[PDB]
Amino acid sequence: DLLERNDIEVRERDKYTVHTLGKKKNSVAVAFVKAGKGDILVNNVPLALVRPEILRTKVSEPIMILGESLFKGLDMNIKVAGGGHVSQIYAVRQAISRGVLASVKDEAARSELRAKLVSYDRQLVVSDPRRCEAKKFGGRGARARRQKSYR
Amino acid sequence: SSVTRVPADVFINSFAAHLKNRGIIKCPAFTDYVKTGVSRQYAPRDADWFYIKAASVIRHFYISGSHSIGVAGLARKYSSLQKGKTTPHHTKRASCKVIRSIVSQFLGQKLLIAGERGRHISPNGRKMVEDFAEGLQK
Amino acid sequence: DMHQKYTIIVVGKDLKLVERYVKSIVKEGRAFGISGPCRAPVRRLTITTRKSPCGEGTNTWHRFELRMYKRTFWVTCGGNDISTILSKTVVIPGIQVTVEV
Amino acid sequence: VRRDEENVYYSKYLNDCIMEAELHEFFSRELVDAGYASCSLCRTIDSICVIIQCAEPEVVMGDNHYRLHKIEYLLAGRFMCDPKNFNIWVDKIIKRGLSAEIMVD
Amino acid sequence: VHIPKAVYKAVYAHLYENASLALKEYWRVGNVPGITYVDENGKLCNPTYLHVNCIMQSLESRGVVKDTFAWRHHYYLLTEKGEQFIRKELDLTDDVLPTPYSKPSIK
Amino acid sequence: PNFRGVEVEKLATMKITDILPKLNARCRRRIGKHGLSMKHLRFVNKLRLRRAAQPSQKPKIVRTHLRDMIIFPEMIGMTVSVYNGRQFIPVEIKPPMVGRALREYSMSYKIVSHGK
Amino acid sequence: MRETEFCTHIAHKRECRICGNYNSVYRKYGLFICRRCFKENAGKIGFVKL
RNA sequence: GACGGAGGGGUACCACCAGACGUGGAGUCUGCGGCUCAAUCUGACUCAACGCGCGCACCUCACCAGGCCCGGACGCGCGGAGGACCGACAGCCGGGCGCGCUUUCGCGAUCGCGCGGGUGGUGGUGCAUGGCCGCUCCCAGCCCGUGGCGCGAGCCGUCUGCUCCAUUGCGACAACGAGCGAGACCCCGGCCGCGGGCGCCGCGGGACGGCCCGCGGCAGCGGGAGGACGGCGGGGCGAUAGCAGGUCUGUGAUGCCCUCAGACGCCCUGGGCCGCACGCGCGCUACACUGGCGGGGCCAGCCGGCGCCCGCCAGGACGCGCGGAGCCCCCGCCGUGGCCGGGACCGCGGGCUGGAACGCCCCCGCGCACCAGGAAUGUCUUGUAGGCGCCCGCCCCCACCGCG
């Protein structure tokens, strides 16, 4: 759930070759890749399986913009802990896309292929600094106060 | 695994139709009269609510496996909040008696054999439930 | 030598003081097979009191927080050896040393 | 994650800090006039070793050292201290102009 | 007011021996640890916080014992003039010395 | 008129134990997991032995500070002070009235008379 | 004598630890210290405004 | 100086505009005002009072009705030890407390008086006053040395140019140097590295207005790209000077003044602050159709323990140390019906815990108002508004409150 050694704690042996972190809105997804037979499963769960079915189409964005020959064969096991629900999906999306990037590895212009994915979706390779703010004395919420009786 | 690939909704609904032919568990009468939960607005109208709950506990049980889920644990999967009060609602548990019967009955069928902190599936049951999933996906 | 396993735990308010005691236990223990130090998640002790003694004014509140950091050191040694290590360790007054057999 | 959140010592350490505030009050009650400025107790070896940094050390000893451990003995009724297990490190505080409590006294 | 002469004389001695007392003040019924005594029935008993205070105050009021008050506590520091009056009540002897009379010297 | 399955005379002669099995939760657990205090218990035998020994019109009607003691079926037939927080309120217990605290029948409040 | 009703009541009579005040005991961590009393004694216990 | 329906510039969602969610209309609750009562303990009263002084069945507790009890220290003057005090079964009075009676029992100066003195007190005056806080203050000014100018009050620097949230600078100047505010600093994130590690947690570094282009006396100033992040992260600490602001009701912070034993001392017993037209000052839940209510896929971050067995639950037993939200998302059931909207009022039980419910929860009735809110108001620009839940503070009991 919170920054633990859960990065690889669940799996023993079968060392998965790639480790790639994806993070959106306090949700941690470490991507493990073994370059198999088209296993893109994340959270030990199918790509088609999702909390919001409509949201799955967004998490298939590297698949549509980047060549499918990449996702045609690969292997994946991702530990996603934290996040409300939709936070987990973008974090997952950051993880898998970085996981494909880690696989490209040797070609020096790996970034150039990845930037087609940034151009279609920025933050698909970048992590946002957006985090929950805090309340202050007299304030029910972070950026408000008890309604003021007199101006 | 295909038990993580069978969508939870499809697995649970499909499993209970042959459980109805099976005659496993035997949902009692007072339980089918009572409303589930201490926060539910009124009784669920599923009629076969007890039988449908029995397909709900043993699927989440496959994922829980060795760690185990006690009586409170399956109530957690269906935990709700009261929708009718002048003051704000603080979250509360569902009914303990109905949940205590569903896995105690499941111990009786030998699919679940448990002796640890609360409940764990007998391997024969884990395999068989997984086998129902094996039928479900392909 | 009845090599008992000892777990040494140190809880202290100041990080500057804590690191110095942690370094001495690691420094003293190289001869005795000391396991490296375990840093605890910070233990927050927040107390929030409206600052005003009386009720006048938009109550403004003092969040007074005390941070506790605890350090775990595993040692496999004789009962005396920790005592010999003790003279060498620099004792900061009031810092707590916990010997867990 | 497998350790009790009921770590009993975690509460114990703050008890030493209220002991420190009580000691501060204890010496503020009449030993601030004697010169008490700062205090630090050590219960790590159950020594109850307290440093009374103070403007002039000789005042508590007086002429016989009789009351020197009487302050520890006062703490003996409160915390079962033994004369000499506990110690009072009343020493010299130099540049007493820098010291504030006694400067204002 | 009935305060036993055995509670009195033994109580004076506990204060005399350590030349010290630290009691969290108690408004009413209380038992003070560190002081124990023998009743007329041969029973070992502990004195009462209400009764003990009435004597504690009296000995600091006599001036025999110096006293401090930190909110809800009495810190008693016995005086040499006090030691002689304590001997005039206990029926003990001048040679007997309070335990902190000497020995805390630090080198 | 009949109270908890017992007629007025039957409940009147019935013991405290007899009316207790069919009663409200506060009443059942008043003696079920608890009991009565020794002061409360003594008060019972300061009117009981007087209620059963009438030599004419009662000369007692004792004034008692104790108030929230659940009334007993036997104590029916007599006037109890049920002290409100200031003055005693004379209260005659009806036989159907039993099974609830003497607190309910005593008024410590002003009825209304404000609304200005 | 008075002992018969002497302080017969049994209920918490908790007080602020440093003071004799009864309100705002603030037993959050077992610090039975007072709230108005706490401001005078917070840094010594190690709490700081940060 | 301060005012100004004076001007010249600044700046702030406490100002406003483009918008947003409101509140005021509805019910419900909590705190006032105003009533009533034996008593409703009170302080506050435009921002800068009014769910606020950290959760009143008791205690708290300040007040009302009843009574017990001394705890009148230390010095002298007395009374005076088989006689100072203090306890007492019944029969009582009396909720009651051997208080005080009938009583016939015990004690043993441990003391009772007289004084002088100590003696406490949520008792008054916060226009005696400490401390601390509210505000002025989403707000930048303050003063010193030497020298100038003035009889002096005072000026000058400390500025009628520009820039900045900001005497924030850069230029220029009878001022010239200093400083204190603001900054800096610290706390948590944006990211990474080194040691490590159980509890991912300690120590470093790093976005620098650096560079590009345009303007800039120059300070700065836009448009930019790389980039975890654009030119304070979210916070704290906060000058000089004030206020007759608040608190003597937190206190061994206390002055004067009062009550000092039929006490404003201190214990018990039952009250009250939970009474109470209307009016308010916050809140909370609604008015349904992006809503219900539906079982049934769930998901956290504060940082938190579970099991088993009866019981609808409420809970209770027997135990082992151990573990997670709602909304939403599912398929359904459902016509615009004060409705299967809403959840009031209030009968009937089951419990909890507490000396004790008058506290509370659950089950089962019941279906209040209300069908989009008049003036007049607030509060806020990104993880923000709103929506939706968790934890704590207090607390046997109990959150709508507040800090998070």
SS (H, E, C) chain A: CCCCCCCCCCCCCCCCCEEEEEECCCEEEEEEECCCCCCCCCCCCCCCCCCCCCCHHHHCHHHHHCCHHHHHCCCEEEEEEECCCHHHHHHHHHHHHHHHHHHHCCCCCHHHHHHHHHHHCCCCCCCCCCCCCCCCCCCCCCCCCCCCCCC
Indicate yes or no: strand H within 7 A of the C-beta of B14.
no
Using the structure block, give the residue that is written with the tokens 């499909």: B14
CB A49 within 8 A of CB B5: yes
Beta bridge partners of A77: A32
Specify the pairing of strand E22-24 against strand F91-92: unpaired
Beta bridge partners of C70: C11
What is d(CA E100, CA E97) in angstroms, rounded to the nearest whole number?
A: 8
| H or E element at residue D52 | strand D49-54
* Plot region of F77 (φ>0 → left; ψ -120 to 50 → alpha; else → beta): left
Q: Which residues of D12-33 are buried (b: 16+ CB within 10 A; e: fewer)?
A: ebbebbbbbbbbbbbbbbbbbe
CB proximity E1 to G under 8 Å:
no
Residue B96 DSSP symbol = H
Which residue from C39, C98, C28 is spatially nearest to C68, judged by alpha carbons?
A: C39
Residue ranges covered by each domain of chain E = 1-93
Q: To which residue do tokens 């199918």 refer?
A: A46
Contacts 24+ apart (CB under 8 A), G34-39: G35/C49, G36/C53, G38/C47, G38/C49, G38/C64, G39/C49, G39/C51, G39/C53, G39/C62
Contact C17, C93 (CB under 8 A): no
C-chain residue closest to A146, CA distance: C58
Statement: the CB of A149 is under 7 Å from strand H? yes
Does the domain at D9-92 match CATH 3.40.50.800? Answer given as no
Strand D87-90, strand D49-54: pairing: parallel
Is the CB of residue F93 less than 8 Å from the CB of residue F78?
yes
Three-class secondary structure of residue G20 per DSSP = coil
Residues near A62 by Cβ (< 8 Å), separated by ≥ 6? A70, A71, A96, A97, A100, A117, A124
Pairing, β A76-82 against β A27-33: antiparallel
Q: Please, what is the angle between helix D70-79 and helix D8-26, to 10°?
A: 140
Under 8 Å between Cβ of C51 and G36: no
Helix (H) or strand (E) holding F12: helix F8-13
Angle at the Cα of E100 from the Cα atoms of E46 and E9, rounded to 5 degrees: 35
CA distances in angstroms from D98 to D94, E33, E60, E76, F32, listed in the order given: 8, 42, 36, 32, 71
- The two tokens of residue B118 are 């609360």
Q: How far apart are alpha carbons E82 and E97 in whole angstroms?
A: 12
Q: Which two tokens stand for residue B74?
A: 């399956």
By CB neighbour count within 10 A (0-12 exposed, 13-18 middle, 19+ buried), where does D102 fall? middle
C-beta atoms surrounding B88 within 10 Å: 6
> Is the torsion defined by CA of B14, B18, B24, B25 positive or negative?
positive
Residue F26 CB neighbour total at 10 angstroms: 11
> Interface partners of A (3+ CB pairs, < 8 Å)?
B, C
Q: What DSSP character marks residue G48?
A: B
Please, what is the Cα angle at F30 between F28 and F36, to 5 degrees? 140
Q: Is residue B137 part of a domain?
A: no
Residue whose token pair is 């302050």: D71
Residues 4-43 of D with CB under 7 A from strand H: 4-7
Which DSSP letter does residue D28 get? I
Element (H or E) spanning C100, and its range?
strand C98-100
d(CA F19, CA F27): 10
Nearest to E18 among D65, D76, D88 (CB): D76
* Beta pairing partners, C8: C73, C99
Rounded Cα distance, D77 and E20, in Å? 7
Taking CB atoms and an 8 Å limit, are D18 and G46 in contact across chains? no
The residues facing C99 across adjacent strands are C8
Angle at CA of residue D1, ends A21 and A84, nearest 5°: 50
Amino acid at residue number F93: I
Dist. CA A114–CA A32, nearest whole Å: 19
The whole-number Å distance from D104's CA to H153's C1' is 39
The tokens for F59 are 């000369």
End-to-end CA distance of chain E: 49
Any bridge partners for residue C63, and if so which?
A: C48
DSSP secondary structure letter of residue D29: I
Resolution in A: 4.9
Residue A5: CB atoms within 10 Å: 6
Residue B138 domain flag: no
Residue at the smallest CA–C1' distance to nucleotide H269: F65
Task: Using only the alpha carbons of chain E, give its radius of gyration.
Answer: 14
Structure tokens at D20: 């420190």
Report how far residue A27's alpha carbon sits from residue A88's, in angstroms, rounded to the nearest whole number. 5
Encoded tokens for C29: 């223990």
DSSP G30: S
Tokens representing residue D72 in the block:
């520890």
Q: What is the DSSP letter of B120?
A: -
Is residue D23 within 8 A of residue D62, CB to CB? The reply is no
Q: Are strands C4-12 and C61-77 parallel, antiparallel or unpaired?
A: antiparallel
CA distances from F85 to D27, D31, F67, F98, F109 (A): 49, 52, 10, 22, 9
How was this structure determined? It was done by cryo-EM
- Tell me if residue E102 falls in helix, strand or coil: coil
Burial C77-98 (b: 16+ CB within 10 A, else e): beeebbeebeeebebbbbbbbb
Return contacts of F23-29, CB within 8 angstroms, 24+ apart. Answer: F23/F99, F24/F99, F24/F100, F26/F70, F26/F101, F27/F70, F27/F99, F27/F100
Residue D40 CB coordination number (10 Å): 16
Alpha helices in B23-137 (DSSP H): 29-33, 49-64, 71-77, 96-108, 123-137
How many C-beta neighbours within 10 Å does residue B86 have? 4
Answer for the pair F48, F74: CB distance below 8 angstroms, yes or no. yes
What is the Cα Rg of chain F in Å?
15
Minimal CA–CA distance to A59: which of A100, A19, A9?
A100
Contact between B36 and B44 (Cβ < 8 Å):
yes
Dihedral sign from CA coordinates of B2, B5, B6, B9: positive
Amino acid at C94: G
- What is d(CA E67, CA E75) in angstroms, rounded to the nearest whole number? 6
Q: Give the residue carrying structure tokens 């030598």.
A: C1
Task: Give Cα separations from G8 to G3, G13, G30 (angstroms).
Answer: 8, 12, 26
| Beta-carbon count within 10 A of F74 CB | 21
Inter-CA distances, D75 with B92, E79, G38, Å: 49, 18, 23
Contact between chain D and chain C (3 or more Cβ pairs less than 8 Å apart): yes
Give the integer Cα–Cα distance in Å for G27 and G39. 15
The H or E element spanning position D61 is helix D58-61
Rounded, the Å distance between the CA of B40 and C1' of H326 is 14
Phi, psi angle pair for C50, to nearest 5°: -60, 130
Q: How far is CA D25 from the centre of its chain?
A: 10
One-letter amino acid at F75 equals M
Contacts of D10 in chain C (CB under 8 A): 11, 43, 68, 70
Contact assessment for residue E106 and residue D68, using Cβ atoms and an 8 Å cutoff: no
Q: Which nucleotide is nearest to F99 (CA to C1')?
A: H349
d(CA E11, CA E54): 12
Nearest nucleotide to the CA of B90, by C1', is H389
Q: Which residue has the tokens 């004789």?
A: C78
- How far does the CA of F99 sit from the C1' of H126, in Å? 55
Give strand letter and number of the nucleotide nearest A25 (CA to C1'): H383
Domain span holding position B32: 2-131
Q: How far apart are CA B74 and CA B58, in angstroms?
A: 9
User: Is C34:C77 a contact under the CB 8 Å cutoff?
Assistant: no
Rounded CA-CA distance B109/B113 in Å is 9
Task: Give SS3 for F32.
Answer: helix
Identity of the residue numbered A55: L
Closest CA to A74 of A30, A50, A104: A104
C44 touches chain G (CB under 8 A): no
| Spatial distance between the Cα atoms of C51 and G35, rounded to a whole number of angstroms | 10
User: Which residues in range 26-65 of chain B are in contact with strand H, contact meaning CB within 7 A of any of its atoms?
Assistant: 30, 34-46, 49, 52-53, 56, 59-60
What residues contact residue C61 under an 8 Å CB cut-off, 6+ apart? A137, C48, C49, C50, C51
Torsion of CA C16, C20, C21, C22, to 10 degrees: 100
- Calculate the CA A62 to chain-centre distance: 12
CA distance D82 to D55: 26
For residues G38 and G35, what is the distance between their CA atoms, to the nearest angstrom? 5
The residue ranges of every structural domain in chain C are 5-100
Residue G19 and residue G14: Cα distance in Å, rounded? 12
Spell out the SS3 assignment of C32-91: HCCCCCEECCCEEEEEEEECCCCCCCCCCEEEEEEEEEEEEEEEEECHHHHHHHHHHCCC
Residue B44: partners with Cβ closer than 8 Å, 6 or more residues away:
B35, B36
The residues, ordered by sequence, that sit 6+ positions from A32 with a Cβ below 8 Å of its Cβ are: A8, A11, A16, A17, A18, A19, A76, A77, A78, A79, A99
Residue E19 has a CB neighbour count (10 Å cut-off) of: 25
Does the CA dihedral D11-D13-D19-D25 come out positive or negative? negative
In chain A, the residue whose alpha carbon lies closest to the alpha carbon of B8 is: A49
C35 sits within 7 Å of strand H by its CB: yes
| Tokens standing for residue A88 | 């987990």
How far is C-alpha C56 from the chain's CA centre?
41
**Strand H positions with any atom < 7 Å from protein CB?**
14-15, 22-23, 27-29, 34-40, 43-44, 46-50, 52-55, 57-61, 64-65, 67-71, 73-75, 85-88, 94-99, 108-112, 118, 121-122, 131-135, 186-192, 195-203, 227-229, 233-237, 245-247, 250-253, 266-272, 275-277, 281-286, 292-315, 320-331, 333, 342-344, 349-358, 361-364, 377-386, 388-396, 399-404
Instruction: Compute how many other C-beta atoms are within 10 angstroms of the C-beta atom of residue E99.
Output: 17
- Residues in Cβ contact with B137 at an 8 Å cutoff, skipping those fewer than 6 apart: B2, B5, B6
d(CA B109, CA B106): 5
Backbone region of residue E31 per phi and psi (left: phi > 0; alpha: psi in -120 to 50; beta: other values): beta
The token duo for B31 is: 């339980």
CA D79 to chain centre: 13
Tally of residues, chain C: 101
- Tokens representing C8 are 């040494």
Nearest to F59 by CA among F77, F44, F79: F79
DSSP character string of E7-76: HHHHHHHHHHHHT--EEE--SSS-B-TT--EE-TTS-EE--BHHHHHHHHHHHHHHTSEEEEE-SSEEEE
